[PDB]
Amino acid sequence: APSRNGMVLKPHFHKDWQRRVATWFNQPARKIRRRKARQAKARRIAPRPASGPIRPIVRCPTVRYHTKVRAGRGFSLEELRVAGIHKKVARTIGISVDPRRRNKSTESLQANVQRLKEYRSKLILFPRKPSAPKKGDSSAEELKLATQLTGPVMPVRNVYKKEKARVITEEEKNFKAFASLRMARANARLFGIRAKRAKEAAEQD
Amino acid sequence: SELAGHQTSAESWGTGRAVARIPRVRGGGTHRSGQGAFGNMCRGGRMFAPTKTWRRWHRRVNTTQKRYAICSALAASALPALVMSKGHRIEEVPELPLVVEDKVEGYKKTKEAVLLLKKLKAWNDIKKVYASQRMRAGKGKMRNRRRIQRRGPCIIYNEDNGIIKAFRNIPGITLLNVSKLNILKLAPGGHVGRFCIWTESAFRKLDELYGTWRKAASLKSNYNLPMHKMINTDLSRILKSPEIQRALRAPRKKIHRRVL
């Protein structure tokens, strides 16, 4: 069966594939369905924005992706308590509540708190009666626009630091050599055996 | 086909029962019993290696070539000798790249549209399309496609205001927006050079939409105009400029045929 200098082929076709072929032909029809679903959602809600719940600021979890930042799921009830608002009241306001999320980072804690304070600033709500506990005048001409697009406060906004200019100094360019990583790596590899030999030297009395 | 021609059940007879080794239907009385079963060379068998609904129908083209072809078709629409060599009637028509006022795109009645085309002298071209809208030749008359009808002028506009309602049912005509162009409308049949009629705001918006060679396109993000291969290309001018004819050998024109 093989031939001249050609690559080894192992295609996965021995299984009777021609029976179970699901084929994209209804793909434009699904795109039109999902457009009509989104426009129906926009007309069926009210003043409430599309993609209504706000989403947090969240960093990926892999030595590969931790530089980036991602629109997460919810606001990690510690953060939502620091916002000073009750749990299901946040679900009614449009603030996403995800109780499994934990906060080790004070930085991302405070960043989520700032995002909560900005959302509570941008919030314009309408009670039924004339009590108007939270509201005002003709509220910015029905806030001049009904519905928003693609995240409420544009949840990505990947922040970019400058580190513009600085004069090179000493110590650094005499110190920060290649050998630091290798010495630290060997220190981390041999952290345990040195302690074991310390215990041996204590035992030998 | 997508379904069996193997609805019949079948077996062979073998080396005995002289006739053949094709599978045969098994039965009696009904005079299909003993005919040719599934296969190619038989009556009421499957076609050979039959068509399947997962054939690779659609094809992808690069977006830069999709824009390059639009630029090439619009550039071919500017020259008068190209578009007459497709088959339009531009003999008594004013300028090539026609550009009417923005009063056109607010029309509501089609009699003003016919009046506009008659005064712009493309009505001779519409009269050709009226002259040639014959019946289709072939087997295609059965499947819902009966009128051969040639393509006329395409009106290009922006900011839709009711020009579609006006120009819509003049036959053979094409009505087509600026920000959504078509190669299938700007070059029907794969030949370059379809006659076109523009509008003021459209014809101003073109240079915003594709740029010059000096500045980039503003509406389309990463796209520049294409590179240009020969800068000046009148080959007769180049060969009869003195810089070449200084450095030519000689016209050698003696024939020197066969000597007996």
């Binding site: - | 059965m142 819902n144 819509r168 049912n169």
Partner: protein, 127 residues
């Protein structure tokens, strides 16, 4: 040009609905235009036909200025029969000849209450 997504350009479906439409649609199909003086008088282009009109033929083998009365309407054959239009067989028996009602000009109607109502609906819709 067709803009509904719920009506057919399809030749097969149109011929099938045509040759199998029931009688109360075959009435609308077998429709005749009115003469131009009567359309001036009534402001209506066309009408369904019935048993009792006064009918002139515009085209065929039997043409022109012969205003006769219809007698039968085969909606099964899409054919009306006119009283003057005859032909003998071989055996000397006369028989009516088939005329499709598109080739038919109505000169007088039969007036009736439902025809007055249909005529008033036509005039009110043409407005």
């Amino acid at each position: 040009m067709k803009f509904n997504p719920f009506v057919t350009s399809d030749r097969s479906k149109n011929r099938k609905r045509h040759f199998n439409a029931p009688s109360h649609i075959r009435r609308k199909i077998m429709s005749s235009p009115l003469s131009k003086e009567l359309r001036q008088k009534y402001n209506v282009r066309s009408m369904p036909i019935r048993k009792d009109d006064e009918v002139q033929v515009v085209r065929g083998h039997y043409k022109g200025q012969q205003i006769g009365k219809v007698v039968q309407v085969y909606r099964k054959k899409y054919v009306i029969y006119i009283e003057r239009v005859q032909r003998e067989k071989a055996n000397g028996t006369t028989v009516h000849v088939g005329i499709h009602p598109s080739k038919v000009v109505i000169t007088r109607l039969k007036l009736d209450k439902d025809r007055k109502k249909i005529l008033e609906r036509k005039a009110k819709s043409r407005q």
